[PDB]
Curated annotation (Swiss-Prot), chain B:
Gene3D superfamilies: PGBD-like superfamily/PGBD. It comes from the Bacteria. May be involved in the functional assembly of glucose 6-phosphate dehydrogenase. Transmembrane segments: none annotated. It comes from Synechocystis sp. (strain ATCC 27184 / PCC 6803 / Kazusa). NCBIfam families: OpcA. This is Putative OxPP cycle protein OpcA. It holds the Pfam family OpcA_G6PD_assem. The gene is opcA.
UniProtKB/Swiss-Prot annotation, chain C:
It comes from the Bacteria. Catalyzes the oxidation of glucose 6-phosphate to 6-phosphogluconolactone. Signal peptide: none annotated. The chain holds residues 298 to 509 of 509 of the full protein. Substrate binds at K62, K67. Belongs to the glucose-6-phosphate dehydrogenase family. This is Glucose-6-phosphate 1-dehydrogenase. Disulfide bonds: none annotated.
UniProtKB/Swiss-Prot annotation, chain D:
It holds the Pfam family G6PD_N. It comes from the Bacteria. It comes from Synechocystis sp. (strain ATCC 27184 / PCC 6803 / Kazusa). PANTHER family: GLUCOSE-6-PHOSPHATE 1-DEHYDROGENASE, GLUCOSE-6-PHOSPHATE 1-DEHYDROGENASE G6PD. Substrate binds at H194, K198, E232, D251, K356, K361. GO terms for biological process: glucose metabolic process; pentose-phosphate shunt, oxidative branch. Belongs to the glucose-6-phosphate dehydrogenase family. This is Glucose-6-phosphate 1-dehydrogenase. HAMAP family: G6PD. GO terms for cellular component: cytosol. Its EC number is 1.1.1.49. The lineage of its organism: Bacteria, Bacillati, Cyanobacteriota, Cyanophyceae, Synechococcales.
Length: 493, 320, 212, 506
């Protein structure tokens, strides 16, 4: 099932992080016979490069940021499909030169014509690049040219709409791949198979047995590098729209009728089209901000947010979030969906907790008089598996109940994980299956859902009005009040 | 003031180009949206796409400056004007407004103590004008609900006996009740005869009509004070379409609240009338009705015919 | 507190059938200061595995406008609302089973108002025994005596339900067996439906008594 | 009578702007007898803008008034009164006329400047609607020429209507789609085919989604099967050539009888809209199939009607009519057995039916519920009376359901009684013409009662094997024949009794 050979163009290559993100991956793919021996790569951009310079820099990159070059003869057998054609971004003449170079490479290398265009330019150049690409008519045949656009797909709703309108007027909506996200081919398929292949877990998924769900994603690393990148985005266009809006769709989705991408994506859009926040008028029951200050981590001191290089000591960019969404369809009417994220919190973990309801009437007595209800605990982070807790009997001549749980870890019956998510992403891009990518409607709907809170938090305010939590505590107390206003508690994790 | 037109050139370089709107707002508070002029009796023109033509008019008697306002009416598409104070003719500003503005909208709920002012409004309707008072929109469900009782074919002949109608409304202005009475009279070919008045704790009025058979007609309005008006005065509480014959089929009574079911006594009150119930139809919002009326434009046959009878009754009130 | 699960009341002078009717403390036999109830309302609540949290209402009476017996069951609202009403009025589906006047089964549901737009209006179906099966003039005493002579006891109590019913009603009975307080008894005019306190009892929660 | 004199007038609605309905194919005396009488009646009660100029089109040309003469000519034969004659005078002046050739690309240039000239004469708003009403073989040539001149390009000011039918087989439907798709959008093409704007059909949704009891017991847990029935009592009129190459499978089973099926096994839409509803109809049509595809004799039976008796008068057989060819093979009675494969209709078969020269006209959707688990009340007659819930979309419209009740008498017994509700005796309003409703909707624009593009492909795919298999030439003495005036041919009765269920006597 190895894909057919073709040639790659890497716009804006020879820059930063492109080498370490592409060359080792493609090299490992080629070494593992993932591609036929007729694979070539081509550079781009304006700086006066050289073919020998290209070889030297690629060798340095693979040596420094990868396993190695392996056998020298292997590199000799590889080193025939790496060329260069310098040209400006907005030069139609350079584009015609590229077309002539591509034609010559097709005639000589005999790549049979099929092509995939990779784009890796800075995100403030998508419109001119796409427009000038469409000017020369490089995208006419349907299976001949696929264009991949890197993160991020705009910032606010208007920018995304303009980008969509520009893209729609050049090529048919069958070749554009928006990459994005990081959910591989393991978790998505595993969860779908677990949900849609058993005859017990399905009838207990509607609104008359389920009470509420929680979705948690936590990290422990600080802001680290990319201070300039973070200062312009904050943790609402970074982790609460790309990643955290996929677990919601997968958890609250109606059953499909097939397996190909069409039905899955249609059901996802249909679910996402009927969601809203809780209190649109008053944004105090549907959102809490935050920022991490100095604290203790791993028995060592760690500075607060306003002490890193490049961040001014007056910034108000959040690093924590908490929403309360709610669905309004014939199945999930009246069951809140508490979400979460953050940074510098301890115990890096992801989770999906579903809490059932209590029995109609109680005839037995609890040890702690609490009677903890049953819970499903789908896990996604390491030690993946499913855990469920129910009631049992305390030994002795008395009737009391105590909470115990079963367990099933994927790491015992399995554990041989697949390759890097990037490798599978590239293979799927080459062969062609849009199951793991995102359509236009999904992006626009997510932006519409998050618009009000984003606009409200974007406005300037008092510098010292940010609720603050030290590095190590789970969250500022405002989130605790948000969850305790109704009674249900945050999962202790 | 002279910068109202000159500054527009600066705005021209800088939009919403649709029908304009006008307001008066007697109240001192706050002191397709194409051109909103927030008159509140100088100039404070500033257009920010919701262009703003707000003018601060803290000084009264701005009729003279209204000459250029009439020139600033933006005559490109049919436009609408809101006059939320009162009816008048001495104040010459209305005369210029009616000739200039394509259509005007008023509300029959904010009127002051006098009640003959509504008569002055009623008289203007007979002259060819364009008034679409929103209080008529509030009677949409009541009119629909009344027609629901007689729908099945079995009660076809019942409508030919109707003689007794009573209306119960909150104490105060009776503009909402008189409109309903005029509507039913028009549909059965009734004409006014006499008009009396019995002031008291309930303000029991009395109207008498004629008929093709010349049978007497009796109707009365009761002003039961609830002391719990929900931000809007003068709303229906119930109605009773009774009978005064010997072998009449039956009547019809429509309660609306717990206290509104006080008519379940006497002889046949709970027996000779078939009592229904309605959840609640009262104290709507001005915003939703305004939008729907703004959407439509033209002339209504039903409203004019109802207002024709209302004019006749009020002209006899002073003599009666 | 027994003011949320029971309200008594006597009947006084009024109008009945076009003629005046005397009040209770004006008839032969009764003293002019009696406190015997003539109207009782309750609110039971069954706590088994299938009727949890669904309340039952009961009310007898005397000198009411008309003679009727009924059993009305009211279903819940739809999970989602998309279709608008024709008169801004929404009602739930109700099943009823009349008993005394003309035995039958009835049901009510919504359907679209003919026209050009999409609105709903309430409507109902019907079924009567006297128009399909026939007319029965059976006497209860006759069947009872025949069963007693033969013996097929099904309609006779086992005295266990007798003790149970007495236990269920005992608190209200003990509370109402009180000293006089002659002026502390609500009165409802003969011809009306109920004193206002029962009305408050039902409307404290939202639902309203069926105006039969 | 005079039902509800309180109901003189209360509604509020309006068609937005004027327009010119350029009726194609003014010849053939069909436009003059179907469309023009329809619009003229609507103008009498002021349901249209003041000026509705109609531009007839034909290969042959007449004078302006001579064309108007034939417009009146067809009015009289279906005249419903004229009132004051001055009403027709302004109507006669309103209607214009032009001419040209159907297949001449330059002929439209004469046409295009003509109505453009009328735009300067009237200056109402400028609007174009096309109603090509000619033979099906003319559908492609007419469509391509409009794109060449490009005179329809505004997505809001241009609407195109395609007349029945739409194709012959799956390969024919796709061919027409390619032509229209490349030259038009999706929010401009209307495909009036069904005449199923009958008020009861849009009532089949409100009764199902606005109640709280009728939804929970509508799925595979309680229902047993469904029988959809359509019957007529009028044979083939002398126009047999149109029917000769059609067959009753392609005439009233691909377009009409499938609409009743899509509205009985569809999921509740999220919100009422234009595309939020028709998107749900497609999903069920993508998960249905015949019961058996190898042995086609278990999922379909054809037939033909021969001489018999209908109303006490002798009736000739099918192969006797003035125009049909003796020893034919075109079917008249068709029956199928469809199944649905999803998570709420698994294993509940659907039975469909149709025909001609049946005893009386009806239309039913009978749903049958399962049997009670315990049978303590055995009673008499084997208790073989399960309760059903039957709708009705024909004369005597209403909803009726049957259920059991105790029979008077000391011994236990169970009779069968039903409670019903009919529209005639609850509202007291006369019926309305369905055709007028569809034409009014073509002005406002809803695209709710008109089938989409990709949906009409799914209808053709479902009966793929049946149409091809029967079309092959076969022995003339191999088609079952049934008498006129009786319900079903002998063979077709065996299909249902094998499973253990019997056709509803109705």
């Amino acid at each position: 099932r190895t894909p057919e050979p073709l040639i790659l163009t890497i716009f804006g290559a020879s820059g930063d992080l492109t080498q370490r993100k592409l060359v080792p991956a493609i090299y490992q793919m080629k070494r593992e016979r993932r591609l036929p021996p007729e694979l070539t790569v081509v550079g781009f951009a304006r700086r006066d490069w050289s073919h020998d310079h290209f070889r030297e820099q690629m060798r340095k990159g693979i040596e420094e940021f990868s396993t190695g070059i392996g056998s020298e003869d292997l590199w000799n057998e590889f080193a025939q499909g790496l060329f260069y054609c310098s040209g400006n971004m907005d030069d139609p003449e350079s584009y015609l030169k590229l077309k002539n170079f591509l034609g010559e490479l097709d005639e000589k290398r005999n790549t049979r014509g099929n092509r995939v265009f990779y784009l890796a330019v800075s995100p403030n150049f998508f419109p001119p690049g796409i427009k000038q690409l469409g000017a020369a008519g490089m995208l006419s045949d349907p299976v001949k040219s696929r264009i991949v656009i890197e993160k991020p797909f705009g910032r606010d709703l208007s920018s995304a709409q303009s980008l969509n309108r520009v893209v729609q007027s050049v090529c048919k909506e069958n070749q554009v791949y928006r990459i994005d996200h990081y959910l591989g081919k393991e978790t998505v398929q595993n969860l779908m198979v677990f949900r849609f292949a058993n005859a017990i877990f399905e009838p207990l998924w509607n609104r008359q047995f389920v009470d509420h769900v929680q979705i948690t994603v936590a990290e422990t690393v600080g802001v680290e590098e990319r201070a300039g990148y973070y200062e312009s985005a904050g943790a609402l266009r970074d982790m609460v729209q790309n990643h955290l809006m996929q677990l919601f769709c997968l958890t609250a989705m109606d059953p499909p009728n097939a397996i190909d991408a069409d039905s899955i994506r249609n059901e996802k859009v249909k679910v996402l089209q009927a969601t809203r926040l809780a209190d649109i008028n008053n944004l105090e029951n549907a959102g809490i901000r935050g920022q991490y200050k100095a604290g203790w981590m791993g028995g060592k001191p760690v500075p607060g947010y306003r002490e890193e290089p490049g961040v001014d000591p007056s910034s108000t960019t959040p690093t924590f979030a908490a929403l309360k969404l709610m669905v309004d369809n014939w199945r999930w009417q009246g069951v809140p969906f508490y979400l979460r994220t953050g940074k510098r919190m301890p115990k890096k973990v992801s989770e999906i907790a579903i809490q059932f309801r209590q029995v109609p009437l109680l005839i037995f007595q609890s040890v702690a008089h609490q009677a903890n209800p049953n819970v499903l605990s789908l896990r996604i982070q390491p030690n993946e598996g499913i855990s469920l807790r129910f009631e049992a009997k305390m030994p002795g001549s008395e009737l009391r109940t105590r909470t115990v749980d079963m367990d099933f870890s994927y790491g015992s019956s399995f554990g041989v994980a697949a390759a890097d998510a990037y490798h599978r992403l590239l293979l799927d891009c080459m062969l062609g299956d849009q199951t793991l990518f995102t359509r236009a409607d999904e992006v626009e709907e997510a932006w519409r859902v998050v618009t009000p809170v984003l606009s409200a938090w974007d406005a300037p305010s008092d510098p010292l009005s940010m609720p603050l939590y030290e590095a190590g505590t789970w969250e500022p107390a405002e989130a605790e009040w948000l969850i305790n206003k109704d009674g249900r508690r945050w999962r202790r994790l | 003031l002279e910068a109202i037109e000159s500054e527009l050139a600066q705005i021209w370089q800088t939009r919403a180009t649709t029908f304009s709107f006008l307001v008066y707002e007697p109240d001192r508070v706050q002191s397709n949206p194409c051109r909103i002029i927030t008159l509140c009796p100088q100039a404070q023109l500033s257009a920010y796409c919701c262009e703003y033509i707000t003018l601060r008019g803290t000084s009264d008697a701005l009729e003279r400056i209204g000459g250029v306002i009439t020139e600033l009416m933006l005559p490109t598409l049919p436009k609408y004007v809101w006059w939320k104070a009162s009816p008048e003719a001495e104040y010459g500003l209305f005369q210029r407004l009616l000739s200039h503005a394509d259509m005007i909208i008023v509300d029959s709920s904010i009127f002051n103590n006098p009640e003959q002012d509504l008569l002055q409004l009623a008289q203007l309707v007979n002259k060819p004008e364009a008034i679409a008072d929103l209080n008529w929109s509030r009677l949409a469900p009541w009119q629909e609900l009344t027609a629901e009782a007689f729908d099945p074919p079995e009660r076809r002949s019942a409508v030919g006996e109707i003689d007794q109608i009573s209306i119960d409304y909150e104490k105060g202005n009776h503009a909402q009740a008189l409109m309903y009475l005029g509507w039913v009279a028009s549909r059965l070919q009734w004409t006014p005869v006499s008009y009396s008045y019995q002031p008291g704790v309930y303000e029991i009025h009395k109207i008498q009509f004629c008929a093709p058979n010349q049978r007497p007609i009796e109707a009365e309005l009761a002003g039961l004070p609830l002391a719990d008006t929900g931000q809007v005065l003068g709303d229906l509480i119930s109605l009773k379409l009774g009978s005064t014959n010997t072998q009449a089929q039956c009547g019809t009574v429509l309660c609306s609240g717990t206290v509104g079911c006080m008519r379940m006594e006497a002889g046949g009150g709970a027996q000779n009338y078939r009592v229904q119930q309605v959840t609640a139809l009262d104290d709507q919002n001005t915003e939703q009705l305004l939008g729907r009326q703004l959407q439509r434009w033209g002339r209504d046959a039903l409203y004019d015919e109802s207002m024709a009878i209302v004019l006749a009754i009020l002209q006899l009130s002073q003599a009666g």
